[PDB]
Amino acid sequence: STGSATTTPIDSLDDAYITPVQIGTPAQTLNLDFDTGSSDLWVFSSETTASEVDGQTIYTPSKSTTAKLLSGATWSISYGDGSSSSGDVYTDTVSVGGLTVTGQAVESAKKVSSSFTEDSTIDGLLGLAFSTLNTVSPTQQKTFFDNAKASLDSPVFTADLGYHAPGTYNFGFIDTTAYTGSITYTAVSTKQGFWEWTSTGYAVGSGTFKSTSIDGIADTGTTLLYLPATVVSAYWAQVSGAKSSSSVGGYVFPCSATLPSFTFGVGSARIVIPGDYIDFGPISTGSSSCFGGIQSSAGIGINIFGDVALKAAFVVFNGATTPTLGFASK
Ligand SMILES: NCCN1CCOCC1
Numbered sequence: 001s002t003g004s005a006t007t008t009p010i011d012s013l014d015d016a017y018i019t020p021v022q023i024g025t026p027a028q029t030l031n032l033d034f035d036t037g038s039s040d041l042w043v044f045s046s047e048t049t050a051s052e053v054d055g056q057t058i059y060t061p062s063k064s065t066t067a068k069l070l071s072g073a074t075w076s077i078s079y080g081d082g083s084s085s086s087g088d089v090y091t092d093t094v095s096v097g098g099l100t101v102t103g104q105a106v107e108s109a110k111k112v113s114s115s116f117t118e119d120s121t122i123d124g125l126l127g128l129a130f131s132t133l134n135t136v137s138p139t140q141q142k143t144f145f146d147n148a149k150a151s152l153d154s155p156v157f158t159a160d161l162g163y164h165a166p167g168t169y170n171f172g173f174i175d176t177t178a179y180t181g182s183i184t185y186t187a188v189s190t191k192q193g194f195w196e197w198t199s200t201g202y203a204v205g206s207g208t209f210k211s212t213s214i215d216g217i218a219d220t221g222t223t224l225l226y227l228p229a230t231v232v233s234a235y236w237a238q239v240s241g242a243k244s245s246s247s248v249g250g251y252v253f254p255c256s257a258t259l260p261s262f263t264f265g266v267g268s269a270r271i272v273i274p275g276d277y278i279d280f281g282p283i284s285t286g287s288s289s290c291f292g293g294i295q296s297s298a299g300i301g302i303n304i305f306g307d308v309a310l311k312a313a314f315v316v317f318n319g320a321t322t323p324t325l326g327f328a329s330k
Pocket of ligand 1: 016114116
């Protein structure tokens, strides 16, 4: 079997992408953020603290004939950005673009931090990292992808994110019409529970390619590209007037400047991120300082290939016995 769903940016900056998901019987459609950096399927619900809901569509397990409370099961998660959520757990039927999984753990949020409340366009997250990162206690639960694996034509899912435009998440197949040239595959380490891989280097604009190992994760749930301080300094040195600002919490550049492209290595292949993709607009309304899409990972502890990098490529998340990541130009 296969699944295919459209993902659309939540705003004009591509801060996040939402994908419609059908939960329960009869179906309740929620727009979830597909996250390859986490492994919990959690949704805003009829149980969430009333004051912590601001415009989101809630999942109501009482109106679902296939919903079953997983007795005693609880979950709590904290993301790298200081945001968090927690609650109880249900099992229910979940479908993504025609691909159905019965008995999927659907984590019902009782408490959400303010970061989630203020994003009225995001009804929850669909974790696509490895199931070893799932926070359900005392019995760990499997991701949607792990549960669908047996039924899928091929154990793969593809991410094809648009730049200021809709994109696609495909499950169980590779669309040969969605990319150009060849797919270069690279090894994945699952030791930390992420889609961790090693990039073979970088180039800033039309400069020479620097061969160096950059270990990082393919994370659809992170907006920006977070790279080592050495790389990020070499990039922003090519932008006139760019500087690192402690007040803003990162690199800012004069909005009138034109940004060079950024190339990252995948084996012997090269993925070119256009300079426009690195522009994240004014730091505040009316400001002439703009926020950069390439930031230092020095304070995070891990390099992240977020939406900025992923949206420049067709990305294959191969969940075979030996998992691999594939990249093609599009
Ligand atoms: N809390 C606001 C941060 N969010 C995170 C997800 O994308 C949009 C912006």
